[PDB]
Amino acid sequence: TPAPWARLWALQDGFANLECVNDNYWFGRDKSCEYCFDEPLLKRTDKYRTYSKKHFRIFREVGPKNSYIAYIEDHSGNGTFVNTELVGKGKRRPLNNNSEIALSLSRNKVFVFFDLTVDDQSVYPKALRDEYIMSKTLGSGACGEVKLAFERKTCKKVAIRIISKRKFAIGLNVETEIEILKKLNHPCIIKIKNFFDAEDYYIVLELMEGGELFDKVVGNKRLKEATCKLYFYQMLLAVQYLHENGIIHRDLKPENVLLSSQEEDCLIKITDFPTYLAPEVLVNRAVDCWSLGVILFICLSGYPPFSEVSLKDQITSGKYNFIPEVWAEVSEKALDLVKKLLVVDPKARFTTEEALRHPWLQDEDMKRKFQDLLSE
Amino acid sequence: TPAPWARLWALQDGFANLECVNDNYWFGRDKSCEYCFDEPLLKRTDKYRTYSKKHFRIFREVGPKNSYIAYIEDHSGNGTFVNTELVGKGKRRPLNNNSEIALSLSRNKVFVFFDLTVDDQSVYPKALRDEYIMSKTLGSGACGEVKLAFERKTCKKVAIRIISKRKFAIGLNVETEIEILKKLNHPCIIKIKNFFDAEDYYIVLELMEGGELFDKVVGNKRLKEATCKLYFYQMLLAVQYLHENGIIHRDLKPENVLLSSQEEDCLIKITDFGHSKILGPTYLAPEVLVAGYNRAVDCWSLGVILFICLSGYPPFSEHRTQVSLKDQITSGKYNFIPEVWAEVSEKALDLVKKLLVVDPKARFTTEEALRHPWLQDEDMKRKFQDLLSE
């Protein structure tokens, strides 16, 4: 009934392949061994007599996070070698995937071990795997694991984020909340494509092939002012839409402003509902507006307005780090808007509506560009 | 020169095992194929003629998180089957580890594919792997990945947490900060066993075999008052030590009170205190929901951890009638269920109350807690001392 957690592969003929289902396997000549060097083929060998009555064992054990770890334990006298190195008499070590087991001699390769407790797709609710193929981890979010997946038949990439129900289990909520987000229909917002419920919550989301605004801005590179304008415009529309649907972001940053292609001109899409923390929080819509200011500052300049006395002191006093050499090539209007957005007092800070009316954004050409991309 | 990213395993004799080094492999009868069904052994077969000139390909591709993803693409007419299911003519799909490749017939198993992009040792800085064997992921922290590891020779379990230097790369800091935490020497605090620096920061920490206080307290189970007392005593010593070394926790909760074995009586160890400083709510103090008093914050937290330990439920929760969680906390009216508390001592309840006081100036300090009657148990104190010998 149970699925195998490991395959052992015989390298020399006169050895059987093993598929590990039980928790423990002894290898040796002894009749009592779960895996016995007894096959009358192997018996005529002289190196056969180099192997011990009870040579070595492979086994599982519960991992500190309810996981499973495979170990090998050498009990031989002429040695059990793993990837060339001797384990040793009475000694014990973890068994990595694709390990080589040699016996009596380092050169004498016998088995290759494969851990199946990896990709191990049984780990997921069947309803989900019937629909998707779970792939690599894409990152560690504010929720938990976001993993790559593929639609079984179309073979389309999707992102699946995984949150643990154990996380709130001391003393359900998400099910109603998902449906509200699911109804949302706008081309600059991430679509919540699907939703599953097992021991964990799985939330299938559309995957953005272009990745994060962050990457276009890390390493002292900067974006053409017009590209900044395009992106920020879209960011304003996005945030406003959220605000109008009673959602406040609270954690807007380049790593969750997503781009839709490797083309410079393209659709921005927002996700996930301290350099970026508002000063008033360091002491609710204004919060997102401060964030955009920062995102804007970084886009135009290629460096952050506040970096590492304290980072907190700089923010609460609202004296952003202004480098003339970097800003000289940026427009007066662009600089102006940034300043309006980076205002300590939230009652003074520009609102998104005020930002959209700001002169810097009065570009009927880039507005048309945005409209074009919606056709794309 | 390059290491193989996959092994293919021949299931039928008259087929070679393949070790994938190149980015693309075509399988087929055709001479041009990187893997050719041509061996004069295989040629006499009748099912040999069921295979296509250009049957299928296996290949790599760069993944979104700088990853590599292995795909199979069927180009046959009689089919390429993967784990029983037909891929299909012109079709393409990802190749999971331990996949079975059949050809022409579902039953006709030929290859088993093994992905080697499965945790490899060489992804990490050599200095580290010379010392440790990297194992399974233990979780995703406030830092990044915490993984299981083993000391190369002793074979002792350790936890290694991995943080990315790319994370702050827009516009080093951690190196000086680590040394301060490294000097800390108290049995109820996690020891920072070692530290490495490559493209990523690796921080080797001691692994707690008992996991999180959280697990012993989730699902309506509760702990014997004496076990609460043992744990909480240790928690007080731990927090006091931190406070005396100028570190305020700010995020004390069951998920970061660690236990040292599956035995009920055992060492508690605390974590994420400067790990909640390396990067820069049931447990949030009411005053934070509204200088050297920032300590009260940790003291409120312990009251909560204490409440939960003795009762098996939280002092403040979310319910659709009692309005906000914030309202309950700021007004300090914890949810008291007589049926649950009847078996808990008066003194224990007393201390909880002293810790759960809205005004920080009134709240018990850790010194005040330790002098509280509930904790005047010379027997449990001796127990603690015993475990230090263990």
PDB file of N, CA and C in Angstrom, chain B residues 174-186 189-193 203 205 241-242 245 247 272-278:
ATOM      1  N   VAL B 174      25.588  42.979   8.598  1.00  0.00           N
ATOM      2  CA  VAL B 174      25.334  41.820   9.459  1.00  0.00           C
ATOM      3  C   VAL B 174      26.583  41.314  10.194  1.00  0.00           C
ATOM      4  N   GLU B 175      27.745  41.434   9.557  1.00  0.00           N
ATOM      5  CA  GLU B 175      29.006  40.895  10.084  1.00  0.00           C
ATOM      6  C   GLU B 175      29.334  41.338  11.525  1.00  0.00           C
ATOM      7  N   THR B 176      29.190  42.633  11.801  1.00  0.00           N
ATOM      8  CA  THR B 176      29.432  43.175  13.139  1.00  0.00           C
ATOM      9  C   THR B 176      28.342  42.713  14.109  1.00  0.00           C
ATOM     10  N   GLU B 177      27.109  42.657  13.608  1.00  0.00           N
ATOM     11  CA  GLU B 177      25.917  42.306  14.388  1.00  0.00           C
ATOM     12  C   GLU B 177      25.952  40.859  14.884  1.00  0.00           C
ATOM     13  N   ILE B 178      26.443  39.963  14.037  1.00  0.00           N
ATOM     14  CA  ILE B 178      26.600  38.548  14.367  1.00  0.00           C
ATOM     15  C   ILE B 178      27.517  38.350  15.566  1.00  0.00           C
ATOM     16  N   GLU B 179      28.648  39.041  15.588  1.00  0.00           N
ATOM     17  CA  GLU B 179      29.611  38.887  16.678  1.00  0.00           C
ATOM     18  C   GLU B 179      29.038  39.218  18.060  1.00  0.00           C
ATOM     19  N   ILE B 180      28.120  40.182  18.125  1.00  0.00           N
ATOM     20  CA  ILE B 180      27.470  40.551  19.384  1.00  0.00           C
ATOM     21  C   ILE B 180      26.603  39.401  19.890  1.00  0.00           C
ATOM     22  N   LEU B 181      25.799  38.845  18.986  1.00  0.00           N
ATOM     23  CA  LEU B 181      24.942  37.709  19.277  1.00  0.00           C
ATOM     24  C   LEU B 181      25.774  36.475  19.567  1.00  0.00           C
ATOM     25  N   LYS B 182      26.958  36.399  18.977  1.00  0.00           N
ATOM     26  CA  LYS B 182      27.802  35.219  19.129  1.00  0.00           C
ATOM     27  C   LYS B 182      28.375  35.098  20.540  1.00  0.00           C
ATOM     28  N   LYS B 183      28.608  36.238  21.193  1.00  0.00           N
ATOM     29  CA  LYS B 183      29.209  36.272  22.530  1.00  0.00           C
ATOM     30  C   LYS B 183      28.233  35.824  23.597  1.00  0.00           C
ATOM     31  N   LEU B 184      26.936  35.936  23.297  1.00  0.00           N
ATOM     32  CA  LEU B 184      25.872  35.588  24.240  1.00  0.00           C
ATOM     33  C   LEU B 184      25.989  34.155  24.739  1.00  0.00           C
ATOM     34  N   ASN B 185      25.892  33.974  26.047  1.00  0.00           N
ATOM     35  CA  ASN B 185      26.117  32.673  26.649  1.00  0.00           C
ATOM     36  C   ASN B 185      25.122  32.419  27.756  1.00  0.00           C
ATOM     37  N   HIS B 186      23.997  31.813  27.393  1.00  0.00           N
ATOM     38  CA  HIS B 186      22.934  31.464  28.336  1.00  0.00           C
ATOM     39  C   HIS B 186      22.208  30.194  27.857  1.00  0.00           C
ATOM     40  N   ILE B 189      18.850  30.407  25.621  1.00  0.00           N
ATOM     41  CA  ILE B 189      18.929  31.173  24.393  1.00  0.00           C
ATOM     42  C   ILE B 189      19.602  30.276  23.360  1.00  0.00           C
ATOM     43  N   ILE B 190      19.119  30.311  22.129  1.00  0.00           N
ATOM     44  CA  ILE B 190      19.797  29.650  21.015  1.00  0.00           C
ATOM     45  C   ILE B 190      21.253  30.137  20.804  1.00  0.00           C
ATOM     46  N   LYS B 191      22.187  29.189  20.736  1.00  0.00           N
ATOM     47  CA  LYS B 191      23.595  29.494  20.478  1.00  0.00           C
ATOM     48  C   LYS B 191      23.776  29.678  18.988  1.00  0.00           C
ATOM     49  N   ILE B 192      24.505  30.719  18.593  1.00  0.00           N
ATOM     50  CA  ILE B 192      24.923  30.891  17.197  1.00  0.00           C
ATOM     51  C   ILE B 192      26.255  30.172  16.995  1.00  0.00           C
ATOM     52  N   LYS B 193      26.163  28.932  16.552  1.00  0.00           N
ATOM     53  CA  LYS B 193      27.279  28.022  16.507  1.00  0.00           C
ATOM     54  C   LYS B 193      28.383  28.403  15.488  1.00  0.00           C
ATOM     55  N   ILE B 203      24.044  31.226   8.546  1.00  0.00           N
ATOM     56  CA  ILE B 203      24.199  31.324   9.995  1.00  0.00           C
ATOM     57  C   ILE B 203      23.871  29.987  10.660  1.00  0.00           C
ATOM     58  N   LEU B 205      23.154  27.526  13.507  1.00  0.00           N
ATOM     59  CA  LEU B 205      22.548  27.634  14.841  1.00  0.00           C
ATOM     60  C   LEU B 205      22.311  26.238  15.365  1.00  0.00           C
ATOM     61  N   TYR B 241      18.027  37.780  30.630  1.00  0.00           N
ATOM     62  CA  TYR B 241      19.396  37.773  30.154  1.00  0.00           C
ATOM     63  C   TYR B 241      19.513  38.686  28.933  1.00  0.00           C
ATOM     64  N   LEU B 242      18.581  38.516  27.997  1.00  0.00           N
ATOM     65  CA  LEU B 242      18.507  39.366  26.820  1.00  0.00           C
ATOM     66  C   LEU B 242      18.400  40.829  27.232  1.00  0.00           C
ATOM     67  N   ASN B 245      21.533  42.249  28.488  1.00  0.00           N
ATOM     68  CA  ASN B 245      22.525  42.436  27.442  1.00  0.00           C
ATOM     69  C   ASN B 245      22.001  43.385  26.383  1.00  0.00           C
ATOM     70  N   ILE B 247      19.166  43.719  24.718  1.00  0.00           N
ATOM     71  CA  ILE B 247      18.397  43.208  23.600  1.00  0.00           C
ATOM     72  C   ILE B 247      16.973  43.053  24.053  1.00  0.00           C
ATOM     73  N   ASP B 272      15.093  34.274  17.467  1.00  0.00           N
ATOM     74  CA  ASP B 272      14.668  35.430  16.671  1.00  0.00           C
ATOM     75  C   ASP B 272      14.619  36.723  17.469  1.00  0.00           C
ATOM     76  N   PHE B 273      15.672  37.035  18.205  1.00  0.00           N
ATOM     77  CA  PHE B 273      15.618  38.256  18.992  1.00  0.00           C
ATOM     78  C   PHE B 273      16.416  39.359  18.306  1.00  0.00           C
ATOM     79  N   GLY B 274      17.603  38.989  17.822  1.00  0.00           N
ATOM     80  CA  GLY B 274      18.435  39.861  16.993  1.00  0.00           C
ATOM     81  C   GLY B 274      18.305  39.383  15.559  1.00  0.00           C
ATOM     82  N   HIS B 275      17.663  38.220  15.405  1.00  0.00           N
ATOM     83  CA  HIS B 275      17.192  37.728  14.107  1.00  0.00           C
ATOM     84  C   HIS B 275      15.938  38.544  13.754  1.00  0.00           C
ATOM     85  N   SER B 276      15.364  39.184  14.777  1.00  0.00           N
ATOM     86  CA  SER B 276      14.433  40.301  14.605  1.00  0.00           C
ATOM     87  C   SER B 276      15.177  41.635  14.847  1.00  0.00           C
ATOM     88  N   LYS B 277      16.338  41.761  14.196  1.00  0.00           N
ATOM     89  CA  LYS B 277      17.174  42.974  14.173  1.00  0.00           C
ATOM     90  C   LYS B 277      18.152  42.865  12.995  1.00  0.00           C
ATOM     91  N   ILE B 278      18.329  41.641  12.494  1.00  0.00           N
ATOM     92  CA  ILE B 278      19.242  41.348  11.376  1.00  0.00           C
ATOM     93  C   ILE B 278      18.743  41.952  10.059  1.00  0.00           C
TER      94      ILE B 278
END
